[PDB]
Design a protein around this nucleic acid. Structure first.
Lengths: 73, 785, 36
RNA sequence: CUCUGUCGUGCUGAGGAAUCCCUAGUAAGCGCAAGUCAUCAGCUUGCGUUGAUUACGUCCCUGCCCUUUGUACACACCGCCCGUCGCUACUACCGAU
RNA sequence: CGCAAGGCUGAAAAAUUGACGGAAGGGCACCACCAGGGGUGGAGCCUGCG
């Protein structure tokens, strides 16, 4: 469920300003569910997914190579 | 080694299982047979009994638009559709798990819905004999069904549920009682008003009206309270007039009329009945102007009342063919043509060949009954301490004698010659009356429970409350010997015809066979899961079977043993209540047994798999594009008509199907089977990969198997020609999906960096002083070596 | 012998030498070697 | 065993159904020694000599074991297996005392 | 030396942790597949076992 989690987060970020998301204050912010730690967790996991998809594009250029080969024939 | 068999069964009109129906006949439920009476004369029309079934019956339903076909629902979870013309079960439905409780019929009678106590409500088709489907809500058991099509139902969790049938899921719910239980359901025949009876004596009233938006069909238009604050058993409406009936399992039935809710529903009449009613039902008579309320009451009775509308009168009753509370003792006459049956409240004596009552009496309580020789008079010892003497010929009361003061006569035995009787009462004594006048008394240490003589009248045997048996001589009353060895008090005894054996039944769930000379326990034997209540031999050894004996036990069992081999020669099923008494034949050819049922009875490849999945998906895609061509040319009716496995899985697209079949296998197996795949099916695979990347889902799986395929077939792809178009398409789609996903996740990580910097800004510090020493995560990471 | 086998199996007391952890000496409680 | 000659298939016939075993100094052929507190001369155990064919993959069949809990953290992957009951707490129900 | 050493008696459970499975996936096996080989089993001698 990583792609579905990222897109609604992507929709969540393009609808609300950064100052609002920063000054977000809710009374249930204590310990591990504090805003700093939650945002850090999302950032780290998204970094891992982003590195994976970068490797995927880098390997997906092979199809362009194969098309250029069939062009050469 | 002859066995026994159920042959006759009688003494019971409607039991405590629910749902009587009226047709001018009353159709009611015995233990396991569904029997049909006339009410005008007490003679029953017929009985419906299936030999394959032994479980009790608990729900009855009459098919609308067509009588003469009836639905019964048993305890095992089975439904039987009977006919009334011929008395056979035309069909059977065995789908539920346990305890059918409510039945309901369609307006056309093709569809039959059954709610059980396993909480599943199941609809049934009546022209294909299959279970249609299986609805499922209801945290706890369902108590009411109705057909509005639409379905209405209600269950013990105080839930009222309105189900669709076109799309098998619930449309609307409501909760009637907040902390209580919705117990009974009543629907007006025009489907406009619905009332639900809840446990506090409440009746909640609901108005009806005859999907993406907010749907609201049921409306709680209010609440009312009846008089009796009991568990309201049922609520039945009138088929024609504006009346209904509310009743709990109690002595009162409240009929109300239909004209706030406190105004629109008023109390018409409160009918008082003799005993606790189990199920009321409605009856309209052709040519009457009144309301035939037909009650079935738990104390074994049918009553039929007239109610006047714009007081009550007990018009008709069916009580004669059965006792009315609970049969406690049986004794059959010496010629074995009649028996006497003793119950709390009455005595009834019956002819066996006609299985029919001939005489009756009123007695208060009834512990023991026994006829005197010459089968003219019958003795009853009763709990108030009395012995009454009645007779068959004059049908009156002859004599009353106060044997014991306030102590129940637990044992009554006639001398084998037939000149005296012995009463063992709940006092510390036992009395000997000959005829009646007191010959002699016997003072014993504890309470006496049961006693019997020797068939050659030589010695008497009593069974006390000390968990002991004392056997005395008959001439003088000297203690001959005694039997111990039981942990709980002996409840019954019987000794053999030649006085060579005593069988003794305790409350310790076991019996003993004693040798009656020196009192040696020939065998202890445990044979019943509960307390063994009564035990009797068969007297006549002229068939060569005098050492055989029956044992009636509170776990609903008769067990037929032989003492010489010490072995159980038969097990007799057929009772569903804790059997209270039995008696044998003096010819020994049959026996009778009287239960708590208030009945008596008389007994005489992974690669190949994804290859096939690819082929199926490609054929489905060919059909979908051809159907798209058809609907493009004209909007006429042309069905897609896909594969039965697709329409069985639920009309998911072939892309979802092949995604499941590519996901299900482990990744090492994925590598191996994708290697196994031949080049012929590679174009199909490339088509599906193009369609995945077009409708992006599982793009890492998409990419990894596309790369595996291209690298293990790179020379064939560059030499082929047809792959050019499909590979252009898959390159464009994969690049579009990867660019989209990479852009979104890069936006996410950039926005997260910005908001984390702003959070650090907001949370840096406020005061400023000499101490900036106050300005991270740590993990443990123990390593063993 | 069959009865002695039945007695042992019911009131199970087998004389099997049991697999001891290899580092009971230096690690008596046997803590897990990961996140703590 | 090798080499050398004389002679030429001539009661002068290499083991069915089944079942068992065997994968490198292994099968098999060959003899010599010893007789070791139990066993073994109708034999047993040593010791040397000659020394191949065919697999050395596979869980398809036949089975056996184990995963679906634990026992370690990085990359990397995987993603809530399923059924019938027992036992326990609570809830109300049924009918005798 | 004393206790042990007086017969309601007469042969054939625990469980919030338990009982039995099923489907998938692995690993191993000349008691499995595969390729070959060799015995015994045919006739006679006999130890042994029943």
């Amino acid at each position: 469920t990583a792609p579905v989690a990222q897109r609604v987060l992507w929709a969540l970020f393009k609808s609300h300003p950064a100052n609002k998301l920063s000054s977000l204050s809710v009374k249930g912010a204590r310990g591990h569910k504090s805003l700093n730690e939650v945002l850090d967790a999302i950032k780290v996991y998204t970094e891992r997914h982003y590195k994976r998809i970068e490797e995927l594009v880098d390997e997906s250029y092979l199809v362009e190579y194969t098309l250029r080969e069939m062009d050469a024939l | 080694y002859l066995k026994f068999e159920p042959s006759k069964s009688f003494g019971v009109v409607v039991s405590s299982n629910s749902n009587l129906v009226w047709s001018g006949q009353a159709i009611v439920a015995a233990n396991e047979e569904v029997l049909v009476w006339d009410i005008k004369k007490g003679e029953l029309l017929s009985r419906w009994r299936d030999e394959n079934c032994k479980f009790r019956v608990t729900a009855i339903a009459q098919s609308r638009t067509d009588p003469d076909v009836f639905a019964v629902g048993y305890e095992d979870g089975s439904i039987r559709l009977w006919d009334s013309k011929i008395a056979t079960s035309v069909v059977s439905f065995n789908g539920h798990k346990s305890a059918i409780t409510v039945l309901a019929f369609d307006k056309t009678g093709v569809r039959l819905a059954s709610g059980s106590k396993d909480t599943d409500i199941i609809v049934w088709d009546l022209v294909a004999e299959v279970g249609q489907y299986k609805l499922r809500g209801h945290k706890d058991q369902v108590t009411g069904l109705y057909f509005i099509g639409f379905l209405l139902t209600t269950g013990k969790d105080s839930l009222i549920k309105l189900w669709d049938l076109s799309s098998r899921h619930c449309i609307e719910t409501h909760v009637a009682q907040a902390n209580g239980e919705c117990w009974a359901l009543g629907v007006s025949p025009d489907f406009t008003g619905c009332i639900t009876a809840g446990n506090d004596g409440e009746i909640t009233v609901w108005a009806l009206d005859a999907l993406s938006q907010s749907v609201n069909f049921l409306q709680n238009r209010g609440t009312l309270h009846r008089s009796s604050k009991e568990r309201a058993a049922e609520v039945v409406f009138h088929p024609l007039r504006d009346y209904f009936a509310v009743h709990g399992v109690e002595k009162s039935v409240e009929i109300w009329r239909i004209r706030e809710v406190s105004d629109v529903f008023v109390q018409h009449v409160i009918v008082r009945t003799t005993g606790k009613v189990r199920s009321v039902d409605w009856a309209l008579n052709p040519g009457v102007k009144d309301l035939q309320l037909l009650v079935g009451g738990t104390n074994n009775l049918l009553e039929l009342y007239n109610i006047v509308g714009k007081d009550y009168n007990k018009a008709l009753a069916v009580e004669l063919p059965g006792h009315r509370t609970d049969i406690r003792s049986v004794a059959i006459s010496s010629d074995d043509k009649m028996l006497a049956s003793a119950a709390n409240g009455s005595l009834k004596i019956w002819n066996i060949k006609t299985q029919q009552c001939i005489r009756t009496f009123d007695c208060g309580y009834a512990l023991c009954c026994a006829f005197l020789p010459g089968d003219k008079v019958v003795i009853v010892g009763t709990k108030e301490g009395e012995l009454q003497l009645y007779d068959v010929a004059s049908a009156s009361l002859l004599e009353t004698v106060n044997a014991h003061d306030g102590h129940a006569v637990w044992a009554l035995q006639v001398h084998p010659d037939g000149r005296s009787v012995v009463s063992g009462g709940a006092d510390k004594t036992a009395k000997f009356w000959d005829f009646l006048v007191q010959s002699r008394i016997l003072k014993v240490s504890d309470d006496i429970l049961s006693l019997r003589f020797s068939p050659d009248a030589r010695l008497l045997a009593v069974a006390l409350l000390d968990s002991t048996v004392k056997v005395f001589f008959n001439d003088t009353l000297k203690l001959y010997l005694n039997l111990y060895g039981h942990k709980l008090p002996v409840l019954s005894m019987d000794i053999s015809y030649d006085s060579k054996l005593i069988v003794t039944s305790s409350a310790d769930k076991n019996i003993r066979i004693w040798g009656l000379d020196f009192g040696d326990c020939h065998k202890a034997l445990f044979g019943h899961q509960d307390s063994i209540l009564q035990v009797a031999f068969i007297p006549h050894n002229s068939d060569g079977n005098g050492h055989y004996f029956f044992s009636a036990s509170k776990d609903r069992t008769i067990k037929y043993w032989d003492a010489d081999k010490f072995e159980q020669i038969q097990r007799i099923d057929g009772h569903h209540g804790e059997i209270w008494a039995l008696a044998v034949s003096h010819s020994g050819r049959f026996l009778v047994s009287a239960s708590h049922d208030k009945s008596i009875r008389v007994w005489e490849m992974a690669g190949e798999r994804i290859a096939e999945a690819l082929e199926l998906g490609m054929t489905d895609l060919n059909t979908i594009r051809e159907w798209e061509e058809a609907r493009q040319i004209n909007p006429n009716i042309a069905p897609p008509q896909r594969n039965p496995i697709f329409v069985a899985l639920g009309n998911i697209p072939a892309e979802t199907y092949v995604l499941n079949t590519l996901q299900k296998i482990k990744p090492a197996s994925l590598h191996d089977a994708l290697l196994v795949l031949p080049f012929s099916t590679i174009p199909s695979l490339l088509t599906f990969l193009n369609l995945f990347a077009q409708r992006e889902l599982n793009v890492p799986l998409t990419c990894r198997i596309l790369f595996f395929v291209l690298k293990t077939h790179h020379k064939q792809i560059v030499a082929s020609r047809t792959m050019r178009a499909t590979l252009e398409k898959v390159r464009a789609n994969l690049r579009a999906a990867l660019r989209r996903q990479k852009d979104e996740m890069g936006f996410n990580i950039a926005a997260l960096k910005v908001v984390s910097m702003q959070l650090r800004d907001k949370s840096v510090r406020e005061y400023v002083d000499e101490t900036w020493e106050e300005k991270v995560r740590k993990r443990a990471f123990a390593s063993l070596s | 012998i069959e009865e002695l086998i039945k007695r042992r199996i019911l009131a199970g007391e087998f004389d099997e030498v049991l697999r001891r952890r290899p580092d009971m000496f230096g690690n008596p409680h046997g803590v897990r070697r990961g996140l703590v």
